[PDB]
Design a protein around this ligand. Structure first.
Ligand SMILES: [Mg+2]
Ligand SMILES: [Mg+2]
Ligand SMILES: [Zn+2]
Ligand SMILES: [Zn+2]
Ligand SMILES: [Zn+2]
Ligand SMILES: [Zn+2]
Lengths: 446, 449
């Protein structure tokens, strides 16, 4: 009867004001942990990436959505936890660049080598390196790339593209910013063109705008990239209904879901943080975004559908899901939008975790690419940045600050948690590039 | 039997610019982690607290002192890690107060009950609660309290005093701030008075200033608190030499080392962070304090002396060590001092890991009381707060920012933060947990009833 446990409940077990009422543990965990350690090979791997979800962003989201003594049933249910560094490299000197951008970090884990901010699947010498997705696929596994951002964003593109600059979304941008990658210059092409060639069995996300561009050379010159996809035998679905009608997705008929021109709609609506906002304004109570839709698939729905379609492959699969806008609303000083995306990712982690729990051979990892600006401060705080007071589930006020156009990333080490075989490799201090080797090893590649 | 190992080396394996060059792991950790789990009785416990040492402070200190791919022999060597919440309570409402202060958090782990910012050893109803040190000592276990801040500070005070306000350092303040605790009003006493009452075998730290205060009641009225200490059996020490000469420390010969009027000297010195400093001012290299003196013991030295004495007790011991100035300097927006204090603490963790690794039945816990405001930001950053560019061990610049305040100091923050542990019952720190869990994990580990 061996079954690996998932933290079923680590909420304040009682009365916050009373002795022991705030404890989250009801007994000794030594046994539960032992039952969580396995070195058996992992058949599948699901990697949930919260863009910019550092410990501060997690605590901010729990506080507001579940209450300080709350528990995220997905994000906090992962038994093995640790901390990992994610610094970039200075392209010229080759020294550490203490604060990474999404592209550099995304490469470190998907390819195993450090790089300079902005690089996508290339090292400082601009040399291409096979990403974990290309390798999983080479070994005959199924591959899935899901996100709530544009498939050209740093995190998803990192698994299927090798360009010198993240800004090379399509032919238009590539000719000018990545001339060496420009298809008409003998290169591999733009991120979108490379994505189309990588051919993952399932790719769900937004960023359909770029697919309207036409190739400047090659076999599909003059055809829009959307037409290319179709000519290459792709299944294009553009809404929840059709996404759900897909019975199978493979290499003969790979799926491509373009659910929005840019980023898919945010979950909650709310005002932007403001200078001395915590005082010049009443507490904010986030409200559901009316554009979220009954037709726009939610992140937990894409994770669920992709898991379904990918589990047909007898050999196994590799999946990457990105709760994307947490990073964006963080950059936008919009507490509600930021918090909503976190809750949104929690629902996704839940699905992945329920599956992994029954299959017994899945490695589920939840982490972030880099930390962000958001900080939870005292109610009466008078900071120089932008602040906003929110009404938390505890019926209490929580103040948030953004003080570093937009808010930047920070280089603090952040949480990384896992569940399943080889999850033991996330405990303690590790580096982001370690994630590549952990996955390469668990999946049995090479 | 494979007796629990520490993470030997988690430093970047090689050339960080090559594939797998920045890796920290050499192989699979599964087996290594299996041998680190033990639910057997912990004979002793050592709790190293870093005031304001969140993941952000840890990083900055590492980047600077050992390079990004560097590794902290102490702090980073603990095998079992996790993240814990430390929210406080709003006294009047009983509702959560997301950003705790030093007082409420220290109380949280020493007594296992949540309280309000400012309180020490009492809940929102002002009722007292026995602390882990009072309990430990009550079981016959030798106990020690060590800090580099003044001994009346929140962290060391929370272990021996129960007052409704951290400000109640001595007789004077207490009379006006904690009336119900004022010895004249039948109160149990000021922080310092209760300190002396607590009688911990080993007590080392600064804050001799309040010891000059004179009692206003009790069997020692008119006598200064220092005179009282001596008259009660305490053996005073004011410098490294005399600290080193001390061979015994127990219940009838308790040790009390006061090495400063206020807090002790900070390890590294450096200029203050300034508006756009990273842009308008050069990269700082931290300058060792010329005045830390050979006459003043370091945290590591105090830790080792404490362990030398406390271990002579056959029953076992409880030790809390506090790397104090990180928080204060973090408040001061003084990068170099903040980093110096994290380095100072790392050496102490190394000392403790050394003892535990040998003894084999010692739980060592390394955590912080709450997260602070410092963040590591991009070098070309134009923030609204105080910023400073430093010269790290890598020969590259790192910019720290302080921008959560426009008032006198840099505030605390409510983010969940790292907690690491090594030894029997270390498994209880993995995953998400609350600061109050730390009390129960310790009490249960020590077998305290
Ligand atoms: Mg991204
Ligand atoms: Mg303290
Ligand atoms: Zn990011
Ligand atoms: Zn970002
Ligand atoms: Zn503190
Ligand atoms: Zn403080």
């Amino acid at each position: 009867t061996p079954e690996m446990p998932v933290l079923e409940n680590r909420a304040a077990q009682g009365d916050i004001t009373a002795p022991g009422g705030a404890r989250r543990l009801t007994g000794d965990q030594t046994a539960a942990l032992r039952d969580s350690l396995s070195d058996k090979p992992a058949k599948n791997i699901i990697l949930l990436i919260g863009d910019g979800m550092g410990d501060s962003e997690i605590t901010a989201a729990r506080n507001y959505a579940e209450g300080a003594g709350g528990f995220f049933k997905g994000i906090d249910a992962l038994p093995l936890t640790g901390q990992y560094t994610h610094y970039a490299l200075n392209k010229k000197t080759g020294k550490p660049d203490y604060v990474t951008d999404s592209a550099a970090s995304a490469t470190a884990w998907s390819t195993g080598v450090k790089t300079y901010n902005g690089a996508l699947g290339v090292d400082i010498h601009e040399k291409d390196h096979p990403t974990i997705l290309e390798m999983a696929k080479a070994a005959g596994l199924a591959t899935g790339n899901v996100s709530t951002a544009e498939l050209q964003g740093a995190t998803p593109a990192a698994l299927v593209a090798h360009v010198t600059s993240r800004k090379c979304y399509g032919p238009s941008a590539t000719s000018e910013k990545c001339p060496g990658n420009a298809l008409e210059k003998g290169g591999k092409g733009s991120i979108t063109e490379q994505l189309l060639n990588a051919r993952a069995d399932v790719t769900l996300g937004g960023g359909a705008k770029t697919f309207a561009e036409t190739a400047t050379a090659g076999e599909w010159q003059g055809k829009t990239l959307r037409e290319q996809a179709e000519a290459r035998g792709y299944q294009l679905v553009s809404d929840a209904a059709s996404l759900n009608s897909v019975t199978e997705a493979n290499q003969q008929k790979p799926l491509l879901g373009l659910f929005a021109d840019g980023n898919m709609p945010v979950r909650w609506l709310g005002p932007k943080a403001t200078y001395h906002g915590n005082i010049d304004k009443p507490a904010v109570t986030c409200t559901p975004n009316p554009q979220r839709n009954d037709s726009v698939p939610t992140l937990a729905q894409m994770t669920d559908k992709a898991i379904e379609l990918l589990s047909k492959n007898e050999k196994g699969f590799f999946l990457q899901v990105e709760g994307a806008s947490i990073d964006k609303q963080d950059h936008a000083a919009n507490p509600c939008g930021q918090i909503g995306e976190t809750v949104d990712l929690d629902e996704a982690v839940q699905r992945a975790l329920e599956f992994a729990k029954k299959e017994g051979n899945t490695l589920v990892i939840v982490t972030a690419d880099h930390a962000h600006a958001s900080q939870i401060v005292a109610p009466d705080t008078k900071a120089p940045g932008l602040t906003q007071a929110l009404n938390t589930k505890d019926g209490a006020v929580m103040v948030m600050s953004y003080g570093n156009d937009s808010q930047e990333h920070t280089g603090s080490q952040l949480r990384i948690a896992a569940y399943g075989p080889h999850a033991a490799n996330v405990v303690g201090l590790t580096d982001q590039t370690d994630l590549f080797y952990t996955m390469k090893a668990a999946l049995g590649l090479k």
